[PDB]
Write a protein that binds this ligand. Structure first.
Ligand SMILES: [Br-]
Ligand SMILES: [Br-]
Ligand SMILES: [Br-]
Ligand SMILES: [Br-]
Ligand SMILES: [Br-]
Length: 90
């Protein structure tokens, strides 16, 4: 029953506000967060994958083809780092 604790980093809060004010519909994002919080598997279409290099141990989930979520599960928390297109974030 217990979910991962959400940890929203400053950069994520800024990304998310900027997206909301330009029309973003967060329904799928909230499903994806709920899935990750319940330690349930993400469907293949999200192309969820571990990042490499300096971005380790973060993972990228493609909420939509132009919106990625960069996040980490550790310490019983779901840490949400960035939300935006791959082009803007990398
Ligand atoms: Br935007
Ligand atoms: Br799209
Ligand atoms: Br802990
Ligand atoms: Br961290
Ligand atoms: Br892109």
């Amino acid at each position: 029953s217990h979910m991962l604790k959400l940890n929203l980093k400053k950069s994520f809060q800024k990304d998310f506000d900027k997206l909301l004010l330009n029309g973003f519909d967060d329904s799928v994002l909230n499903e994806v967060i709920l899935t990750l919080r319940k330690k349930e598997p993400l469907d293949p279409q999200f192309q969820d994958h571990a990042l490499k290099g300096k971005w380790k141990p973060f993972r990228e989930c493609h909420i939509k083809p132009d919106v990625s979520l960069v996040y980490l599960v550790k310490d019983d928390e779901l840490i949400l780092l960035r939300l935006g297109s791959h082009s803007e974030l990398f």
